[PDB]
Every structure is written in structure tokens, then in C-alpha cells.
Amino acid sequence: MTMMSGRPGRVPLQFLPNEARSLPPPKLTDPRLVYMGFLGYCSGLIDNAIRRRPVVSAGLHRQLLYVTSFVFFGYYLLKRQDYMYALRDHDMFAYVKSHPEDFPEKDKKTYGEILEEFHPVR
Amino acid sequence: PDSWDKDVYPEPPRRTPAPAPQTSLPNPVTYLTKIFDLLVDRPVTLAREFIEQQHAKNRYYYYHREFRRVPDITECEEKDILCMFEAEMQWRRDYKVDQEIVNIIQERLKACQQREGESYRQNCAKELEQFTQVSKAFQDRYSDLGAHYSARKCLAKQKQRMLAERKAAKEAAAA
Ligand SMILES: CCCCCCCCCCCCCCCCC[C@@H](O)O[C@H](CO[C@H](O)CCCCCCCCCCCCCCC)COP(=O)(O)OCC[N+](C)(C)C
């Protein structure tokens, strides 16, 4: 089953709806962005290794392009992921609000009144 | 010495008999004691007093930490994690303090047994009696909790014990 595939008002191939602009963008020092850059650096190192070039210093322009492309894609990927989780939270809260009889607020007893069984260890 | 409280670590008044020699032979223990005092104890006291003069020139203090009383596990709601956390920390501190209380009573018992000599079975009745009560209370409080103990399990154990006591008291009243 597709949980949000057909959410009302969804544009077919948008990848980034306008409402997503209401969310704080990921910081450029995001640890996930740094991991994307690390993935790009590893791709560049492996590129040098397969081509039989000096692994660490063969092509700095090519390694830079690897890092830059990975970071550039990761930024928008993170934006979409954060927006999608925000949508999930928004819908879940709205549905709980609109169905009070399904999520009844329960007055909670204290541990002085609850009777828990005791199982001795011996 | 003023290091420790004499009310929590008591001892009898230390009756020591006066030396009453009967023979005219010299006492080797007295000669050896004089030699020990003149050759061993005096340099030790001199060094100690030098160390104490050096200490008195620098004086600083450390403070025993005081902890506030917080609500216990009985007042906490079922899923209120913060009150449960504070109650559990306070319960753990109280458990440690109770362990050290039992330790103090056990030290009293051991010291009495050593001090009284061959009459310990009679002259240590008070210490044995105090240890029996403290041991019974500690066993009632923390026995059988096992690894992974907590304030919740202690509360459940106490509630089970009070239910047993209430049933036993209701049984007696019907006679
Ligand atoms: C091994 C990791 C996977 C690698 C994947 C390939 C990497 C290259 C990325 C591909 C580029 C194209 C994607 C972005 C271009 C525009 C996207 C847009 O046009 O399409 C949108 C769709 O966007 C894409 O779905 C998002 C693509 C992002 C893919 C990355 C997710 C990987 C999973 C996490 C693993 C970690 C990967 C990290 C990379 C290093 C439209 O959404 P919608 O038409 O309504 O959904 C169609 C399917 N439905 C209806 C059935 C739901």
C-alpha cells in the first residue's frame, strides 16, 4: 500500500512543493551533507584507483567535482526528506485532532495506586 | 581522637590495671618500652609535628555535599519519565546510605567481639541485638530485588508485604 502517494493537492513530478519553503533549510555544515561530501571524496579516490593513477593526488579537479556534485545533490535530497517527514507529522497531528474519540485522553494513576506484581530473584 | 564521632562509634571507658610488681627481677618489657620510646616514638612525633606545622601554613576546606529531598516513586505518574528519574536517583542514594548504616553496625559488632575477650558471648548482647534489627530491616527492604533492581520493584515488594500483613491482621481479628 502507498501511504502518501495520493495525498490531495499533490503535484505529480514536483520533487519540492511550494509549502516546503516554510521549513528551515538544512545548514551547509549539516553532518549529513558532510557525509555526502565524504562519499564524493571516496568516489574520487576509487576513480583514481581503478584508472591506475596516484590515488591521493592524481586529479584534483576531478576529485573536487566528485565532492561538489555529491554535496549539491545531497542538499536537495535532505530538503525533500525533511519536508516529507514534516508532512507526515502534520497529517498525524491533524488526524489525532480531528478524531478525539479514537485517541482518548486518559487520567493517569500514580505508582502509589498501581499494583505491580513483585517477582523475587532467588 | 576528634576524627570521628564517639556517639556513633562507642567503646567502654577502658579500665587499665596499675602495675603491681611482686618480684625483684627487672622487667624486660619495661626496658624495651623505654628503648622503643626513646628510639622510635620520639623521631616519629618530631617528623609528624614538622608535617603539621607545614600543613597549618596552608589551610583549605572541603564541604560535605547536601542533597535536597525530592518526591519519591509513589508520587510519580505512570509514564512521567522525569519524576521517575529523580525518584530513582534519590532511592539509589538512600540504598547506599542504608548499606553504610549496616556497615557501621557491623563494625560495632566486630569491635565488641574483639574487645571483650573470652566474655564476648555475654558482653556483646547489645551489639548483636542492634545488628539483628538492622539486618532484618535491610533484608525486608532490599532482599531479592536481584540485578536490575529499581524503586518500582521495591515499591511492589513493599505493597505485597503490606497486603500480606493486612490479611494476617484480618485473620487474627476474627478469633
Ligand atoms: C544506493 C542509493 C540509491 C541511488 C539512487 C540514484 C542516485 C541519483 C539520483 C537520481 C536523479 C533523479 C531524482 C531527482 C530528479 C527529479 C525528481 C522528480 O522529478 O521526481 C519526483 C520523485 O522524486 C524521487 O522519488 C526522489 C529521488 C531520490 C532518490 C534517493 C533515495 C534513496 C533512499 C535512501 C538511501 C541513501 C541514498 C543516499 C545517496 C548517497 C516526483 O515524485 P512522484 O512522481 O510523486 O513519485 C513517483 C513514485 N510514486 C508516485 C509511486 C511515489
Side-chain angles (χ1 to χ4, degrees), chain A residues 2 5 10-15 36 39 70 73 77 80:
Chain A
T2 317
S5 169
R10 176 167 169 164
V11 178
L13 294 153
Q14 202 160 43
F15 184 88
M36 308 291 306
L39 292 183
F70 270 72
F73 171 70
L77 183 69
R80 176 160 170 81

PDB file of all heavy atoms in Angstrom, chain A residues 2 5 10-15 36 39 70 73 77 80, ligand 1:
ATOM      1  N   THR A   2       0.380   2.297  -0.677  1.00  0.00           N
ATOM      2  CA  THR A   2       1.099   3.560  -0.737  1.00  0.00           C
ATOM      3  C   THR A   2       0.450   4.522   0.243  1.00  0.00           C
ATOM      4  O   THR A   2      -0.677   4.963   0.036  1.00  0.00           O
ATOM      5  CB  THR A   2       1.012   4.178  -2.145  1.00  0.00           C
ATOM      6  OG1 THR A   2       1.212   3.162  -3.133  1.00  0.00           O
ATOM      7  CG2 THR A   2       2.052   5.267  -2.318  1.00  0.00           C
ATOM      8  N   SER A   5       1.171   8.386  -1.513  1.00  0.00           N
ATOM      9  CA  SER A   5       1.236   8.521  -2.963  1.00  0.00           C
ATOM     10  C   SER A   5       0.143   9.421  -3.519  1.00  0.00           C
ATOM     11  O   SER A   5       0.393  10.234  -4.404  1.00  0.00           O
ATOM     12  CB  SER A   5       1.166   7.149  -3.630  1.00  0.00           C
ATOM     13  OG  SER A   5       0.964   7.273  -5.025  1.00  0.00           O
ATOM     14  N   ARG A  10      -1.390  17.085  -4.349  1.00  0.00           N
ATOM     15  CA  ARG A  10      -0.018  16.746  -4.694  1.00  0.00           C
ATOM     16  C   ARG A  10       0.287  16.878  -6.186  1.00  0.00           C
ATOM     17  O   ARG A  10      -0.418  16.321  -7.022  1.00  0.00           O
ATOM     18  CB  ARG A  10       0.295  15.330  -4.204  1.00  0.00           C
ATOM     19  CG  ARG A  10       1.666  14.813  -4.592  1.00  0.00           C
ATOM     20  CD  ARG A  10       2.017  13.565  -3.805  1.00  0.00           C
ATOM     21  NE  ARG A  10       3.206  12.909  -4.332  1.00  0.00           N
ATOM     22  CZ  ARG A  10       3.906  11.992  -3.677  1.00  0.00           C
ATOM     23  NH1 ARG A  10       3.543  11.624  -2.459  1.00  0.00           N
ATOM     24  NH2 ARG A  10       4.975  11.448  -4.237  1.00  0.00           N
ATOM     25  N   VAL A  11       1.338  17.631  -6.507  1.00  0.00           N
ATOM     26  CA  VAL A  11       1.765  17.825  -7.894  1.00  0.00           C
ATOM     27  C   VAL A  11       2.564  16.601  -8.335  1.00  0.00           C
ATOM     28  O   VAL A  11       3.469  16.173  -7.606  1.00  0.00           O
ATOM     29  CB  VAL A  11       2.588  19.102  -8.027  1.00  0.00           C
ATOM     30  CG1 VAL A  11       3.073  19.287  -9.453  1.00  0.00           C
ATOM     31  CG2 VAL A  11       1.766  20.292  -7.586  1.00  0.00           C
ATOM     32  N   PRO A  12       2.261  16.015  -9.499  1.00  0.00           N
ATOM     33  CA  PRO A  12       2.836  14.711  -9.857  1.00  0.00           C
ATOM     34  C   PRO A  12       4.351  14.598  -9.763  1.00  0.00           C
ATOM     35  O   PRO A  12       4.842  13.744  -9.021  1.00  0.00           O
ATOM     36  CB  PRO A  12       2.360  14.517 -11.298  1.00  0.00           C
ATOM     37  CG  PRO A  12       1.065  15.230 -11.342  1.00  0.00           C
ATOM     38  CD  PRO A  12       1.211  16.428 -10.446  1.00  0.00           C
ATOM     39  N   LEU A  13       5.110  15.434 -10.467  1.00  0.00           N
ATOM     40  CA  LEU A  13       6.553  15.225 -10.511  1.00  0.00           C
ATOM     41  C   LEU A  13       7.340  16.415  -9.975  1.00  0.00           C
ATOM     42  O   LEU A  13       8.325  16.828 -10.591  1.00  0.00           O
ATOM     43  CB  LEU A  13       6.997  14.921 -11.940  1.00  0.00           C
ATOM     44  CG  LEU A  13       6.512  13.609 -12.554  1.00  0.00           C
ATOM     45  CD1 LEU A  13       6.448  13.722 -14.062  1.00  0.00           C
ATOM     46  CD2 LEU A  13       7.415  12.464 -12.142  1.00  0.00           C
ATOM     47  N   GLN A  14       6.935  16.963  -8.828  1.00  0.00           N
ATOM     48  CA  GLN A  14       7.457  18.259  -8.404  1.00  0.00           C
ATOM     49  C   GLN A  14       8.817  18.155  -7.718  1.00  0.00           C
ATOM     50  O   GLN A  14       9.705  18.972  -7.982  1.00  0.00           O
ATOM     51  CB  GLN A  14       6.458  18.944  -7.480  1.00  0.00           C
ATOM     52  CG  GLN A  14       6.622  20.444  -7.412  1.00  0.00           C
ATOM     53  CD  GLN A  14       5.377  21.135  -6.913  1.00  0.00           C
ATOM     54  OE1 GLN A  14       4.751  20.688  -5.958  1.00  0.00           O
ATOM     55  NE2 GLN A  14       5.008  22.231  -7.561  1.00  0.00           N
ATOM     56  N   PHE A  15       8.972  17.188  -6.813  1.00  0.00           N
ATOM     57  CA  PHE A  15      10.167  16.929  -6.008  1.00  0.00           C
ATOM     58  C   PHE A  15      10.357  17.945  -4.886  1.00  0.00           C
ATOM     59  O   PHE A  15      11.076  17.669  -3.924  1.00  0.00           O
ATOM     60  CB  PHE A  15      11.433  16.902  -6.880  1.00  0.00           C
ATOM     61  CG  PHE A  15      12.691  16.552  -6.124  1.00  0.00           C
ATOM     62  CD1 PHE A  15      13.072  15.232  -5.966  1.00  0.00           C
ATOM     63  CD2 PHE A  15      13.488  17.536  -5.567  1.00  0.00           C
ATOM     64  CE1 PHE A  15      14.213  14.906  -5.271  1.00  0.00           C
ATOM     65  CE2 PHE A  15      14.623  17.212  -4.859  1.00  0.00           C
ATOM     66  CZ  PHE A  15      14.989  15.899  -4.716  1.00  0.00           C
ATOM     67  N   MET A  36      27.762  13.190   2.719  1.00  0.00           N
ATOM     68  CA  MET A  36      27.664  13.161   1.258  1.00  0.00           C
ATOM     69  C   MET A  36      28.968  13.598   0.599  1.00  0.00           C
ATOM     70  O   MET A  36      29.416  12.986  -0.378  1.00  0.00           O
ATOM     71  CB  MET A  36      26.510  14.034   0.771  1.00  0.00           C
ATOM     72  CG  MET A  36      25.181  13.756   1.417  1.00  0.00           C
ATOM     73  SD  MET A  36      24.540  12.155   0.909  1.00  0.00           S
ATOM     74  CE  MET A  36      24.588  12.331  -0.872  1.00  0.00           C
ATOM     75  N   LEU A  39      31.356  10.799   0.811  1.00  0.00           N
ATOM     76  CA  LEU A  39      31.053   9.819  -0.226  1.00  0.00           C
ATOM     77  C   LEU A  39      31.611  10.241  -1.578  1.00  0.00           C
ATOM     78  O   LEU A  39      32.140   9.406  -2.322  1.00  0.00           O
ATOM     79  CB  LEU A  39      29.543   9.605  -0.328  1.00  0.00           C
ATOM     80  CG  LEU A  39      28.852   8.922   0.850  1.00  0.00           C
ATOM     81  CD1 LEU A  39      27.380   8.721   0.571  1.00  0.00           C
ATOM     82  CD2 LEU A  39      29.519   7.608   1.156  1.00  0.00           C
ATOM     83  N   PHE A  70      28.289  15.520  -5.224  1.00  0.00           N
ATOM     84  CA  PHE A  70      27.634  14.797  -4.140  1.00  0.00           C
ATOM     85  C   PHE A  70      26.990  15.756  -3.148  1.00  0.00           C
ATOM     86  O   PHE A  70      25.843  15.549  -2.739  1.00  0.00           O
ATOM     87  CB  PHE A  70      28.626  13.874  -3.438  1.00  0.00           C
ATOM     88  CG  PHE A  70      28.701  12.500  -4.035  1.00  0.00           C
ATOM     89  CD1 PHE A  70      29.308  12.298  -5.259  1.00  0.00           C
ATOM     90  CD2 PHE A  70      28.164  11.414  -3.377  1.00  0.00           C
ATOM     91  CE1 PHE A  70      29.387  11.042  -5.810  1.00  0.00           C
ATOM     92  CE2 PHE A  70      28.235  10.154  -3.927  1.00  0.00           C
ATOM     93  CZ  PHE A  70      28.849   9.970  -5.144  1.00  0.00           C
ATOM     94  N   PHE A  73      23.782  17.437  -4.775  1.00  0.00           N
ATOM     95  CA  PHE A  73      22.611  16.569  -4.780  1.00  0.00           C
ATOM     96  C   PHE A  73      22.097  16.322  -3.368  1.00  0.00           C
ATOM     97  O   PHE A  73      20.879  16.300  -3.137  1.00  0.00           O
ATOM     98  CB  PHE A  73      22.928  15.244  -5.465  1.00  0.00           C
ATOM     99  CG  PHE A  73      21.837  14.225  -5.330  1.00  0.00           C
ATOM    100  CD1 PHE A  73      20.630  14.391  -5.988  1.00  0.00           C
ATOM    101  CD2 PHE A  73      22.008  13.109  -4.532  1.00  0.00           C
ATOM    102  CE1 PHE A  73      19.620  13.457  -5.857  1.00  0.00           C
ATOM    103  CE2 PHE A  73      21.001  12.176  -4.400  1.00  0.00           C
ATOM    104  CZ  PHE A  73      19.808  12.349  -5.064  1.00  0.00           C
ATOM    105  N   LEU A  77      18.299  16.555  -1.655  1.00  0.00           N
ATOM    106  CA  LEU A  77      17.782  15.316  -1.090  1.00  0.00           C
ATOM    107  C   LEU A  77      17.373  15.506   0.365  1.00  0.00           C
ATOM    108  O   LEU A  77      16.301  15.052   0.783  1.00  0.00           O
ATOM    109  CB  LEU A  77      18.831  14.216  -1.228  1.00  0.00           C
ATOM    110  CG  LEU A  77      18.494  12.803  -0.763  1.00  0.00           C
ATOM    111  CD1 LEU A  77      17.450  12.184  -1.661  1.00  0.00           C
ATOM    112  CD2 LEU A  77      19.753  11.963  -0.746  1.00  0.00           C
ATOM    113  N   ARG A  80      14.105  17.537   0.578  1.00  0.00           N
ATOM    114  CA  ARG A  80      12.922  16.730   0.299  1.00  0.00           C
ATOM    115  C   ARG A  80      12.603  15.785   1.450  1.00  0.00           C
ATOM    116  O   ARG A  80      11.434  15.633   1.827  1.00  0.00           O
ATOM    117  CB  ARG A  80      13.101  15.945  -0.997  1.00  0.00           C
ATOM    118  CG  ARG A  80      11.941  15.013  -1.282  1.00  0.00           C
ATOM    119  CD  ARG A  80      11.877  14.617  -2.730  1.00  0.00           C
ATOM    120  NE  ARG A  80      10.913  13.551  -2.960  1.00  0.00           N
ATOM    121  CZ  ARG A  80       9.604  13.730  -3.077  1.00  0.00           C
ATOM    122  NH1 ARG A  80       9.062  14.932  -3.001  1.00  0.00           N
ATOM    123  NH2 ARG A  80       8.821  12.675  -3.275  1.00  0.00           N
TER     124      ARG A  80
HETATM  125  C1  LIG C   1      22.064   3.354  -3.445  1.00  0.00           C
HETATM  126  C2  LIG C   1      21.281   4.679  -3.218  1.00  0.00           C
HETATM  127  C3  LIG C   1      20.242   4.955  -4.349  1.00  0.00           C
HETATM  128  C4  LIG C   1      20.870   5.745  -5.543  1.00  0.00           C
HETATM  129  C5  LIG C   1      19.761   6.365  -6.459  1.00  0.00           C
HETATM  130  C6  LIG C   1      20.346   7.074  -7.736  1.00  0.00           C
HETATM  131  C7  LIG C   1      21.150   8.390  -7.396  1.00  0.00           C
HETATM  132  C8  LIG C   1      20.899   9.523  -8.450  1.00  0.00           C
HETATM  133  C9  LIG C   1      19.532  10.275  -8.201  1.00  0.00           C
HETATM  134  C10 LIG C   1      18.536  10.164  -9.405  1.00  0.00           C
HETATM  135  C11 LIG C   1      18.177  11.577 -10.001  1.00  0.00           C
HETATM  136  C12 LIG C   1      16.641  11.756 -10.250  1.00  0.00           C
HETATM  137  C13 LIG C   1      15.876  12.106  -8.931  1.00  0.00           C
HETATM  138  C14 LIG C   1      15.604  13.638  -8.781  1.00  0.00           C
HETATM  139  C15 LIG C   1      15.229  14.331 -10.141  1.00  0.00           C
HETATM  140  C16 LIG C   1      13.761  14.907 -10.133  1.00  0.00           C
HETATM  141  C17 LIG C   1      12.788  14.037  -9.244  1.00  0.00           C
HETATM  142  C18 LIG C   1      11.290  14.296  -9.553  1.00  0.00           C
HETATM  143  O1  LIG C   1      11.170  14.662 -10.874  1.00  0.00           O
HETATM  144  O2  LIG C   1      10.543  13.111  -9.322  1.00  0.00           O
HETATM  145  C19 LIG C   1       9.843  13.096  -8.105  1.00  0.00           C
HETATM  146  C20 LIG C   1      10.184  11.816  -7.326  1.00  0.00           C
HETATM  147  O3  LIG C   1      11.339  12.061  -6.527  1.00  0.00           O
HETATM  148  C21 LIG C   1      12.095  10.894  -6.315  1.00  0.00           C
HETATM  149  O4  LIG C   1      11.258   9.883  -5.865  1.00  0.00           O
HETATM  150  C22 LIG C   1      13.196  11.164  -5.273  1.00  0.00           C
HETATM  151  C23 LIG C   1      14.561  10.573  -5.742  1.00  0.00           C
HETATM  152  C24 LIG C   1      15.593  10.462  -4.582  1.00  0.00           C
HETATM  153  C25 LIG C   1      16.289   9.063  -4.562  1.00  0.00           C
HETATM  154  C26 LIG C   1      17.224   8.889  -3.325  1.00  0.00           C
HETATM  155  C27 LIG C   1      16.573   7.991  -2.209  1.00  0.00           C
HETATM  156  C28 LIG C   1      17.493   6.782  -1.797  1.00  0.00           C
HETATM  157  C29 LIG C   1      16.991   6.066  -0.486  1.00  0.00           C
HETATM  158  C30 LIG C   1      17.951   6.308   0.746  1.00  0.00           C
HETATM  159  C31 LIG C   1      19.331   5.562   0.583  1.00  0.00           C
HETATM  160  C32 LIG C   1      20.548   6.555   0.763  1.00  0.00           C
HETATM  161  C33 LIG C   1      20.887   7.300  -0.575  1.00  0.00           C
HETATM  162  C34 LIG C   1      21.898   8.479  -0.362  1.00  0.00           C
HETATM  163  C35 LIG C   1      22.728   8.769  -1.647  1.00  0.00           C
HETATM  164  C36 LIG C   1      24.246   8.817  -1.355  1.00  0.00           C
HETATM  165  C37 LIG C   1       8.341  13.070  -8.390  1.00  0.00           C
HETATM  166  O5  LIG C   1       7.688  12.429  -7.294  1.00  0.00           O
HETATM  167  P1  LIG C   1       6.401  11.414  -7.625  1.00  0.00           P
HETATM  168  O6  LIG C   1       6.115  11.404  -9.104  1.00  0.00           O
HETATM  169  O7  LIG C   1       5.181  11.897  -6.879  1.00  0.00           O
HETATM  170  O8  LIG C   1       6.772   9.856  -7.165  1.00  0.00           O
HETATM  171  C38 LIG C   1       6.760   8.846  -8.176  1.00  0.00           C
HETATM  172  C39 LIG C   1       6.671   7.447  -7.478  1.00  0.00           C
HETATM  173  N1  LIG C   1       5.369   7.285  -6.749  1.00  0.00           N
HETATM  174  C40 LIG C   1       4.195   8.109  -7.130  1.00  0.00           C
HETATM  175  C41 LIG C   1       4.959   5.883  -6.937  1.00  0.00           C
HETATM  176  C42 LIG C   1       5.648   7.557  -5.309  1.00  0.00           C
END
